[PDB]
A paper describes a structure:
PG remodeling is performed by numerous autolysins acting on specific substrates and at different stages during bacterial growth. While glycosidases, such as muraminidases and glucosaminidases act to hydrolyze the glycosidic bonds between the carbohydrate units, peptidases, such as N-acetylmuramyl-l-alanine amidases, l,d-endopeptidases, d,l-endopeptidases, l,d-carboxypeptidases, and dd-carboxypeptidases, hydrolyze the amide bonds of the peptide stem at specific positions. Ami1Mab and Ami1Msm displayed an overall globular structure comprising a central β-sheet (β1, 4, 5, 6, 7, 8) surrounded by strands β2 and β3 forming an antiparallel β-sheet, six α-helices, and one 310 helix (η1). The catalytic zinc is coordinated by the highly-conserved triad which constitutes the amidase_3 motif signature, namely H25, E60, and H115 in Ami1Mab and H51, E86, and H141 in Ami1Msm.
The crystal structure of Ami1Mab was solved at a high resolution in its free form and also bound to l-Ala-d-IsoGln, one of the end-product of the reaction. Ami1Mab was purified without its first 40 amino acids in N-terminus, predicted to correspond to the signal peptide required for secretion. MDP was rapidly hydrolyzed by Ami1Mab, indicating that it is an active PG hydrolase that cleaves the amide bond between the N-acetylmuramic acid and l-Ala. Incubating Ami1Mab with the chelating agent EDTA prior to the reaction almost completely abolished the enzymatic activity. These results demonstrate that, like Ami1Mtb, Zn2+ is required for catalysis of Ami1Mab. To facilitate the search for the potential inhibitor’s binding-site, the Ami1Mab crystal structure was probed with the CASTp server to identify cavities in the protein structure. This analysis led to the identification of a single cavity of a volume of 72 Å2 comprising the active site of Ami1Mab. The three inhibitors could be docked into the Ami1Mab active site with similar binding energy (ΔG°). The proposed docking poses strongly suggest that the three inhibitors are able to occupy the active site in a manner similar to the dipeptide seen in the crystal structure. The docking study supports the view that these inhibitors might act by competing with the binding of the PG peptide stem.
Numbering used by the authors: 14 to 225
């Protein structure tokens, strides 16, 4: 585990302007908006702040394990990089694994996590190396006591073709939606410092399980 390289992507920007509406190539024949604002709990806790703070905790734990780390943004209050640029930044580190951290907006009674991965793969690394990462991450999150999403995906897994950040990956990568910000139980855990710590520990267990 020590000496491996992991890049962490806290989804969305600390702040936005109309540049986020400019269209960028999506890695699968189309274009998508440079960025989207992301969601928030009904208490006003923004997705971008949740992902930022959870990624900081993931990074700290990985560094303590001797894992070399990088992030795709440096703050939670200014414009951050577009989704295609984030994939470029990730790829530039030749990482052994990449984890993007998001939280979702779904029906209020729906809760739990889902691990998004590229399907169908557009290159070889997005095949077995990435599917194994996705299944391993799902297994580790559920073993940590997290609930697979009750409202989307299949048993905590979601293969999809619409996400530029997944389509553009040259290294094993997953995008973990940790929960539904619009749900009472997930919002409480996302808004809790110790909830964010538990999310981060579980993601780290998935990274460790995959790299081993
Ligand atoms: Zn998001």
């Amino acid at each position: 585990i020590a000496g491996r390289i992991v890049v962490l992507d806290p989804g969305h920007n600390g702040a936005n302007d109309s540049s986020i509406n400019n269209q960028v190539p999506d890695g699968r024949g189309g274009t998508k908006s440079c960025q989207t604002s992301g969601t928030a709990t009904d208490g006003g806790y923004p997705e971008h702040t949740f992902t930022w703070n959870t990624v900081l905790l993931i990074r700290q734990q990985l560094t303590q394990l001797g894992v070399r780390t990088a992030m795709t943004r440096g703050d939670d209050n200014k414009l951050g990089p577009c989704i295609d640029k984030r994939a470029e930044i990730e790829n530039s580190y030749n990482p052994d694994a990449v984890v993007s951290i998001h939280a979702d907006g779904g029906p209020a009674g729906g809760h739990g996590f889902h691990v998004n991965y590229s399907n169908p793969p557009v290159n070889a690394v997005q095949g077995e190396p990435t599917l194994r990462f996705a299944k391993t991450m799902r297994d580790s999150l559920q073993a940590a006591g997290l609930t697979p999403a009750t409202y989307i995906g299949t048993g905590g897994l979601y293969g999809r073709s619409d996400l530029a950040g997944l389509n553009l990956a040259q290294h094993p990568k997953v995008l973990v939606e940790l929960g539904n910000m619009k749900n009472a139980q997930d919002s409480a855990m996302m808004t809790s410092p110790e909830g964010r710590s538990k999310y981060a520990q579980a993601v780290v267990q998935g990274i460790v399980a995959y790299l081993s």
